[PDB]
């Protein structure tokens with residue numbers, strides 16, 4: 040019992056919904072929905088309905104949605120406000136599910152799939168779909184099975200069936216190491232020709248139509264490709280059968296380069312995992328290849344193979360198919376730990392939106408706010424359009440490029456959401472303006488107090504302190520829910536430990552697992568019952584506690600993305616509640632908060648250390664400040680510390696008992712200055728960084744805004760056993776930096792921070808020596824092949840032609856005629872190497888497709904003519920020089936008067 044929806048669409052005058060009924064069965068209904076909208080109505084009938092400003096309204100109820108749209112359009116032409124939920128899907132969901140949705144995830148068909156398409160050049164265009172689909176793995180969550188569709192005959196090669204028994208063997212028995220926990224879950228179907236396979240897959244899709252559809256890049260490649268492929272071979276009518284409502288929209292997306300095609304399948308919610316990860320991971324990443332993220336998430340990765348992916352089928356079909364399966368599995372494993380599908384499902388059902396709408400803060404919040412106001416008989420405002428006007432962003436301090444021995448950092452809790460609550464910023468809490476001074480005047484508390492009666496932002500805006508506001512209200516709701524679910528997750532952690540206690544030597548009874556709520560700390564009587572409990576039952580309880588812990592995590596990450604979504608939405612001109620004044624209010628208040636507390640921290644540390652106008656805050660970014668503790672350490676005396684932990688202890692205690700109290704005083708004052716609704720500027724200690732005691736390491740350094748390294752010992756009270764390097768914007772991770780130089784540069788930084796100049800100097804000479812010995816692939820830089828056609832004049836480079844594009848040209852010249860070498864494609868990644876003067880390739884560099892060897896035809900000639908000197912200079916030394924000059928060290932020992940002497944020592 041308790042129905043929930045699966046997907047909803049509007050097609051003309053009916054709502055097409057897929058849903059789970061009271062019985063638990065998946066059904067489909069078509070509803071000729073009758074929307075309601077609102078007009079302002081001079082209160083001649085004692086009305087229940089008011090807009091967010093308190094103006095009375097009247098309800099108009101329409102025969103069909105099409106009429107409703109006409110009306111809006113009519114109303115707007117006249118100049119009148121068309122109030123209410125103009126997205127009827129949302130209105131429908133709100134009416135039909137006018138309760139808190141409880142959903143059973145096991146009844147939701149979640150498909151995870153990937154395809155393979157062999158093409159002579161290896162990068163086949165989804166819009167054109169010239170090439171046969173020769174492998175599909177489709178995982179179904181309800182069946183818990185991997186359906187594998189294998190093409191045996193292609194124009195590009197014919198192959199034997201894949202072997203499940205070979206797939207299961209270890210690498211050294213010539214196997215693929217497809218895990219046992221899925222080996223038995225594979226249903227393998229080979230096909231003699233593509234038409235067979237596609238027809239079977241399409242029939243398969245009708246029987247098991249995905250509600251939620253996902254995978255890696257399914258939106259930009261896999262879905263468009265199968266759709267076009269089917270359309271091409273069978274016709275559009277057939278391809279449309281991929282939508283349960285037989286409706287389809289093809290959308291063309293022109294990015295910063297060419298274009299791309301996206302297919303909307305009506306009645307299906309596509310949540311591409313790559314986007315799901317980008318949104319919910321809250322971790323910046325140098326690459327978003329499934330291979331890299333698996334590696335990051337699961338400490339392993341995608342299957343490995345000899346040669347280009349475009350040659351894998353012909354050379355190793357066995358691996359080809361296993362690799363495809365594994366790819367689908369990797370996503371499942373990431374989801375196993377990250378839980379982004381369930382998060383999307385929570386959020387979707389929490390807001391009452393199409394599930395794919397979780398990608399859109401403005402859509403989600405539009406819905407959340409609509410439902411909230413609906414329970415109060417309040418009416419939402421018509422959305423009017425606004426110009427895209429650039430307004431202030433975050434404050435980033437320009438740092439003095441230098442080494443910084445001891446650094447301590449602090450950041451504000453959840454800054455923009457905190458500002459919204461503190462100032463009381465909402466479209467309807469606006470109370471007026473004040474004559475505004477330069478921002479620096481407020482930072483310095485020199486400008487006059489804006490208002491004695493209203494809550495103010497340094498941009499000139501005033502807000503009511505007494506009145507509520509939709510934005511601040513809705514946000515504080517989610518804030519509390521976050522605190523609440525966080526609490527559950529923690530209690531489920533502590534309870535899990537209690538159960539892990541009893542598991543070390545439990546009773547040999549025949550009993551059952553206790554029926555308890557894991558979201559709450561166990562009572563003493565429960566703790567006692569647990570001791571005298573069997574291993575069978577305790578293991579069931581530990582599983583239960585951890586399912587609850589996971590639920591807590593997910594629910595509170597949900598609230599986190601929700602909270603930050605709103606903050607971002609208010610800056611988005613497409614948001615029903617957007618207002619430039621309110622967006623500037625938020626960000627300008629931000630900048631003041633950061634520079635004000637910078638001033639206070641400088642004032643405090645000068646007083647406390649007895650120094651004149653000293654710069655303690657060396658850097659800040661958006662919500663965090665970076666404090667040089669060098670003077671604090673001197674004032675004590677460095678030699679007074681017993682070990683590294685001793686000074687880290689000291690800086691912690693100093694942060695806790697001295698700086699934070701001061702910071703809080705500082706922000707309380709700021710709050711009074713702006714006369715805000717409540718004090719919510721909470722800053723506390725983040726990191727403590729420095730060199731190990733009695734080393735010659737430099738601790739950290741900045742080279743510029745967003746470019747710095749720190750040797751971190753402690754993060755928010757947790758002490759690391761090994762110190763952790765925090766590196767930012769230093770090209771240690773850019774795909775462009777060659778793999779070996781990436782490791783090398785990080786080692787240079789590690790030694791700088793931890794060990795000092797001499798260590799760095801010894802490692803530099805060492806790496807320089809080992810350089811000419813490294814695999815050529817590990818030392819090539821990586822670029823993107825963009826606009827090759829543009830700079831291709833006959834066969835030679837053109838005007839102002841990029842270094843890497845020139846390389847691609849010389850490669851294609853050198854492999855021309857011969858049709859047996861891996862070709863370079865537009866919008867693909869390429870390795871690049873410099874060539875020495877007067878080489879047979881007639882240019883100073885060459886480039887080939889990444890993840891491939893150079894073809895044998897020319898490999899050794901290339902390698903022989905490589906310009907290591909230019910290579911090491913451009914990729915390694917230049918970057919390093921940037922670091923060393925900023926830190927004021929030398930990576931090569933400066934000449935000495937002693938150099939010429941043969942000593943026994945150092």
Ligand SMILES: Nc1nc2c(ncn2[C@@H]2O[C@H](CO)[C@@H](O)[C@H]2O)c(=O)[nH]1
Pocket residue numbers: 074075076122123124130131133134412413414415416417418419
């Ligand atoms: N309270 C409220 N109801 C709305 C609004 N927009 C559309 N409606 C619809 O009008 C009806 C109110 O009883 C419901 O069917 C709602 O789905 C709105 O802005 N506020």
